[PDB]
Amino acid sequence: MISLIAALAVDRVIGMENAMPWNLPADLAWFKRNTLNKPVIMGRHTWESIGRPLPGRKNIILSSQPGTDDRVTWVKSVDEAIAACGDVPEIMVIGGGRVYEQFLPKAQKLYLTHIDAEVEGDTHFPDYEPDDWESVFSEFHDADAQNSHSYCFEILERR
């Protein structure tokens, strides 16, 4: 099973200048809980944005060019990325925009955080078709001293 996990600001913005400009510790904690002990697939730009391997997960990087770090696994196509995960129950796709586009048609589950924040950005989560997806979990949180925007955790499953 393939799942996508992402945090979206208003208008599906996910990034600007190869960064995420907000800081929401509660969402990063949600990301860690839902990805720990699973393989994670990311594109090369997202790898550069994170800047280090994510511990406790098999890190798989998509790039058309040879890898430059043997602490992670480098693959050259979507099918190779999936194969490199082995026989696991759930593969997590962690972006970015180009990678999400390619994996969306193959995904059964979306873990989305909706952040109430207006961000100028240059990268968006794919338009998906709402009729294809059932909301099975949602949890709203107001802003607090640690998290400066309100946010909604949602899990959707392909109908």
Ligand X SMILES: NC(=O)c1ccc[n+]([C@@H]2O[C@H](COP(=O)([O-])OP(=O)(O)OC[C@H]3O[C@@H](n4cnc5c(N)ncnc54)[C@H](OP(=O)(O)O)[C@@H]3O)[C@@H](O)[C@H]2O)c1
Ligand Y SMILES: Nc1nc(=O)c2nc(CNc3ccc(C(=O)N[C@@H](CCC(=O)O)C(=O)O)cc3)cnc2[nH]1
Binding-site positions for NADP(+) read 7, 13-19, 45-46, 63-64, 76, 95-102
Report the 3 state secondary structure along 80-149.
Answer: HHHHHCCCCCCEEECCCHHHHHHHHHHCCEEEEEEECCCCCCCEECCCCCHHHEEEEEEEEECCCCCCCC
Distance of CA 149 to the CA centre of its chain: 19
Which of 87/91 has CB closer to ligand Y?
91
Q: Diameter of the chain by CA atoms? A: 44
Range in contact with Mn ion (rule: CB under 5 A) among 6-14, 28-36, 55-63, 149-157: 149-157
Stretch that binds ligand Y, among 28-36, 60-68, 73-81, 137-145 (CB under 6 A): 28-36
Q: Does 23 bind ligand Y (CB under 6 A)?
A: no
Window contacting ligand Y (CB under 6 A); options: 29-37, 70-78, 100-108, 133-141: 29-37
Out of 2, 3, 4, 6, the only residue in the binding site for ligand X (CB under 6 A) is 6
The distance of closest approach from Cβ of residue 153 to ligand Y in the complex, given in angstroms and rounded to an integer, is 8
Of 109, 90, 119, 84, residue with least CA distance to 8: 119
If one asks whether residue 28 binds ligand X (CB under 6 A), the answer comes out as: no
Do residues 143 and 150 touch, judged by C-beta distance below 8 A?
yes
Minimum Å distance from CB 159 to ligand X? 23
95 is a contact residue toward ligand Y (CB under 6 A): yes
* Contact by Cβ (8 Å): 54, 72: no
Choose from ligand X, ligand Y, Mn ion, none: what does 108 bind? Cβ within 5-8 Å by kind.
Answer: none
